[PDB]
């Protein structure tokens, strides 16, 4: 496929990948009410307003099938509030459609977004992952992202623990 940045016309598609991949991944880990509480439209909105904001450093990428379907998705940007000095930007989200997993699209999406952040000259990057997600965690280790620490969060009222993986975005060659 082709990994590319995305505009507003991509959002709807990005939305389906988010919700569909969320539901198919966190079910049994995140309360069903939450997942069933996810929305295609509202989600599109979420990424909608943010795209339309000159002051927003966010960078969105999108995997595109030969058909032209948005199947992959990743968003990068300035570390929100991680709290790990040296780590300037973080990978906010990244999801590949279940039927498109184990195809490379995840590292594809990953590199593109890192290089961009690398080019824009960012120090280091970090991604917050869930622990009851040995799959995801496995991924970022295939990439080298070393462990920083954990964190208690809350989804659908559930208390989940996240874990961060740091990536030298500087001199490192991506």
| Domains in the chain: boundaries | 1-174
Contact 3, 80 (CB under 8 A): no
28 annotated to a ligand binding site: no
27 annotated to a ligand binding site: no
DSSP 8-state class, residue 156: T
37 annotated to a ligand binding site: no
- CATH class (in words) of the domain with range 1-174: alpha beta
Q: What's the rounded Cα separation, in Å, for the pair 90 and 114?
A: 10
Q: What's the rounded Cα separation, in Å, for the pair 168 and 148?
A: 12
77 annotated to a ligand binding site: no
Resolution, expressed in angstroms to one decimal = 2.8
Contact 30, 6 (CB under 8 A): no
12 annotated to a ligand binding site: no
172 annotated to a ligand binding site: no
96 annotated to a ligand binding site: yes
DSSP sequence for 106-153:
HHHHHHHHHHHHHHTT-SEEEEEEESS-HHHHHHHHHTT-EEEEEEEE
Contact 162, 129 (CB under 8 A): yes
Cβ-proximal residues to 139 (8 Å cutoff; 6+ apart), any chain: 106, 107
**Gap sites in the chain (C to N > 2.5 Å), preceding residue numbers:** none
| Deposited experimental method | X-ray
């Amino acid at each position: 496929v082709r990994i590319r940045r995305a505009g507003l016309e991509d959002l709807p598609g990005v939305a389906r990948v988010l919700v569909d991949t969320w539901r198919a991944t966190y079910r049994g880990v995140v309360p069903e009410a939450f997942l069933e509480g996810l929305s295609y439209e509202g989600q599109a909105e979420r990424w909608a307003q943010r795209l339309k904001t000159p002051t927003w450093p966010g960078r969105l990428f999108v995997a595109e099938s030969e058909s032209g379907e948005v199947v992959g998705f990743a968003a990068f940007g300035p570390d929100r509030a991680s709290g790990f000095p040296g780590y300037t930007a973080e990978l906010w989200a990244i999801y590949v459609l279940p039927t498109w997993q184990r195809k490379g699209l995840g590292r594809a999406l990953f590199h593109e977004g890192a290089r961009l952040l690398q080019a824009e000259g960012y120090g280091r990057m970090l991604v917050w992952v869930l622990k009851e997600n040995p799959k995801g965690r496995g991924f970022y280790e295939h990439l080298g992202g070393v462990l920083l620490g954990e964190r208690e969060i809350e989804l659908g009222g559930a208390k989940l623990w996240e874990v961060a993986y740091g990536f030298d975005l500087g001199g490192h060659k991506w």
